[PDB]
A paper describes a structure:
Here we describe extendable linear, curved and angled protein building blocks, as well as inter-block interactions, that conform to specified geometric standards; assemblies designed using these blocks inherit their extendability and regular interaction surfaces, enabling them to be expanded or contracted by varying the number of modules, and reinforced with secondary struts. We construct twistless helix repeat (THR) protein blocks from identical straight α-helices (typically 2–4 helices in each unit); the length of the blocks can be varied simply by varying the number of repeat units. Restricting helical geometry to ideal straight helices with zero helical twist in principle considerably limits what types of structure could be built, but this is more than compensated by the great simplification of downstream material design, as illustrated below. Using X-ray crystallography and electron microscopy, we validate nanomaterial designs ranging from simple polygonal and circular oligomers that can be concentrically nested, up to large polyhedral nanocages and unbounded straight ‘train track’ assemblies with reconfigurable sizes and geometries that can be readily blueprinted.
Numbering used by the authors: 1 to 201
Write the structure that this text describes.
Amino acid sequence: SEEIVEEAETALKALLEEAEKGGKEDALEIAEKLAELAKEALEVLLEAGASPELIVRLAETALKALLAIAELGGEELALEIARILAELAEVALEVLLELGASPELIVRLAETALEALLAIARLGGEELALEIARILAELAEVALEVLLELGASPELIKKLAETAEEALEAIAKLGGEELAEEIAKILAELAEVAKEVQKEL
């Protein structure tokens, strides 16, 4: 279990190095290969009954590596890895659900993935930040549903929902009018999901 994390983390760092050495042309193939390796390692830890902290460490290790590639990479590469980063985080949140992880580890992993998306949008242009906001919103709604299936706590749902609230608000200050208008719709959909999760608890 813990040896699976150590070998997986070695590969994630090994791929990250070859992403930095190579140009941005190969950085996307390495980013996709880094997430597929991390996702496959999460399933091995899933069927092995690993502690949820190992799942979070492995997930965050791959989330940081993906973020590092997006930061080094251009504007087009930023949005691509963001999709990869959220897809990998949604897989990880569902493994933590299957294991019945503590709700605090769910928020921890979700905050980590949401902060990385916020960093990618900040480094990106205006049309960049709109798609990140949709990605960020859909990830936060997934994490709210995971907390709903785990009992959670009214303060944890409020904490995660407001973390996504402040993240989306920071994107509104990032771009012009058409972005600030779409953030309001995005904020409404998010607040609607947190409305139902707080209702059923």
